């Protein structure tokens, strides 16, 4: 009975859809049955089917988005979705290479006049 994430990961794309459809059908009938009394035994499933439906849809979106960021990993311009959201301000920090650019004047200074390890009283 149980639909797990476990197995769905490997399955083919068309196969995942049929499964979702077949759950969407099963959900319908229980919703119909909830109206016409049905039975507590049916009105369990409705919660189960809902979550298994989600489990399916989730796997699909994870697969579609993993494939997508494989496709752009390398390209310079990539969709905003696939770009890394940290925090508005944090996406305007200096570049990680740009903020350790020394001016040649400053570099020369570090070359000629390095701070020295020293001690006193001997």
């Amino acid at each position: 009975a149980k639909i797990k994430a476990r197995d769905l990961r490997g399955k083919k794309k068309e196969e995942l859809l049929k499964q979702l459809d077949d759950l969407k059908v099963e959900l319908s009938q229980l919703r119909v049955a909830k109206v016409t009394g049905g039975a507590a035994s049916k009105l369990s499933k409705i919660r189960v089917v809902r979550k298994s439906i989600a489990r399916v849809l989730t796997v699909i979106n994870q697969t579609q988005k993993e494939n997508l960021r494989k496709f752009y990993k390398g390209k310079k311009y990539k969709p905003l979705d696939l770009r890394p959201k940290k925090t508005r301000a944090m996406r305007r920090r200096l570049n990680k290479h740009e903020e350790s650019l020394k001016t040649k004047k400053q570099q020369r200074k570090e070359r000629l006049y390095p701070l020295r390890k020293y001690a006193v009283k001997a």
Partner: peptide, 13 residues
Amino acid sequence: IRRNPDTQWITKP
């Protein structure tokens, strides 16, 4: 401006 070190002080928020 960003990459010129001598100006990149203005790029700070």
